Amino acid sequence: SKFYQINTTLLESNEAVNKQTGEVVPLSPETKLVYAYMLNQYRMYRKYGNRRYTESWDKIFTVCCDVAAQKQKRLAKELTTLGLIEVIGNKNAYKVVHSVESIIETWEFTNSKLN
Amino acid sequence: SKFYQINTTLLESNEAVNKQTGEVVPLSPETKLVYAYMLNQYRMYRKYGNRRYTESWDKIFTVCCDVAAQKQKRLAKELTTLGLIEVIGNKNAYKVVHSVESIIETWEFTNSKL
């Protein structure tokens, strides 16, 4: 395939608000592209031998962005805070990409700049 | 639509280099998102019977990012320089969205890091 898919809600939103706590998580532009890439990769790992997704954050950010290490950590933390990416394990760690659909009971995506 | 599409080359590249002039256009993340959005919007305008895609740059930038006026001007310039967007008129200006494939004879996409 010659295209990645960018989730409609994510593209059109600049933040997510926790429905239980009110916490506000800004959504950065890089995060949206990183999510699109990881979703595709997760699906490719599944298709090609049904492997769990273990691509390193470093490799992921090298493909999608050109940012400082400190920034990369912030962007990765947006993803994990929202639950779009779930890191499971420590010794045999892997990454699970979750749909936006699956976290809406917890996170309400909005665009505070639209009147 | 449930999702917007972004060309593989665009997502995986951090710069475009003009094959004839050497000019380099770094590909900001916002640029990629704005392009994906505008490509779909252009398609929807045409699907609903319109010849022209007339959404304003201000509305476009409001939906896709949260950046200051000067940055929006520069991001729009990244797009017009590449020829991915062609702008016609002053106020109420319509925008023609071209494919990445239509510009590769002029611009080479790369990821120096990758």
Side-chain angles (χ1 to χ4, degrees):
Chain A
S1 178
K2 284 177 273 59
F3 295 86
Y4 288 94
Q5 308 163 3
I6 307 178
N7 175 275
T8 291
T9 304
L10 292 190
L11 185 152
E12 300 175 353
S13 301
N14 74 334
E15 63 179 35
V17 181
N18 187 293
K19 295 181 175 181
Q20 292 77 47
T21 70
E23 182 188 349
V24 180
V25 171
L27 304 177
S28 305
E30 300 81 351
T31 303
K32 301 173 184 187
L33 298 164
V34 169
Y35 179 77
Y37 175 75
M38 297 173 78
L39 178 64
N40 192 63
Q41 288 288 95
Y42 178 86
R43 292 167 172 178
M44 301 294 94
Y45 276 59
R46 189 176 64 196
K47 178 181 168 65
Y48 294 97
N50 225 333
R51 307 186 65 86
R52 296 193 183 83
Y53 187 43
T54 59
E55 188 177 8
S56 70
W57 287 114
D58 283 359
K59 271 100 157 194
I60 288 161
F61 281 96
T62 295
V63 174
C64 307
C65 309
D66 194 9
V67 298
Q70 196 165 244
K71 188 165 185 178
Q72 167 172 319
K73 185 171 296 189
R74 178 258 175 87
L75 301 166
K77 185 63 159 182
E78 290 183 5
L79 291 166
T80 64
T81 296
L82 292 172
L84 292 171
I85 302 300
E86 179 192 11
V87 180
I88 299 175
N90 47 5
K91 52 184 291 187
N92 298 312
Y94 61 92
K95 301 179 177 66
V96 175
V97 183
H98 292 278
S99 70
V100 168
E101 126 219 324
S102 78
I103 63 166
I104 65 185
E105 299 288 10
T106 312
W107 297 97
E108 179 188 32
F109 288 88
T110 71
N111 186 337
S112 64
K113 302 286 162 288
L114 287 171
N115 304 334
Chain B
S1 51
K2 173 169 180 178
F3 65 87
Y4 286 88
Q5 295 175 21
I6 184 169
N7 174 284
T8 290
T9 308
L10 186 52
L11 185 147
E12 304 173 351
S13 299
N14 66 343
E15 64 187 15
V17 180
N18 186 301
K19 295 178 184 178
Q20 298 89 50
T21 70
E23 180 178 13
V24 177
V25 176
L27 300 175
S28 305
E30 300 89 345
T31 300
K32 299 176 186 181
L33 292 164
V34 165
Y35 177 74
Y37 175 76
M38 293 180 73
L39 181 65
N40 191 69
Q41 289 281 99
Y42 175 85
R43 285 170 174 172
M44 298 286 287
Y45 269 68
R46 309 273 289 171
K47 175 175 180 172
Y48 277 89
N50 308 289
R51 245 187 122 187
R52 306 310 186 189
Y53 170 43
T54 53
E55 190 177 9
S56 66
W57 282 115
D58 288 350
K59 293 182 297 181
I60 290 161
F61 281 101
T62 294
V63 173
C64 297
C65 38
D66 186 22
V67 303
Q70 179 179 349
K71 186 158 185 173
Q72 300 193 20
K73 178 185 176 181
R74 178 172 63 82
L75 295 168
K77 192 175 180 187
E78 291 182 10
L79 293 170
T80 57
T81 299
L82 291 174
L84 288 175
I85 303 300
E86 181 192 351
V87 179
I88 305 175
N90 188 311
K91 278 299 177 185
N92 308 321
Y94 71 84
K95 307 177 179 66
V96 182
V97 188
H98 299 277
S99 66
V100 173
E101 192 67 17
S102 73
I103 70 165
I104 68 179
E105 63 194 340
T106 301
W107 292 93
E108 177 159 38
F109 288 78
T110 179
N111 186 327
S112 42
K113 297 266 284 301
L114 192 64

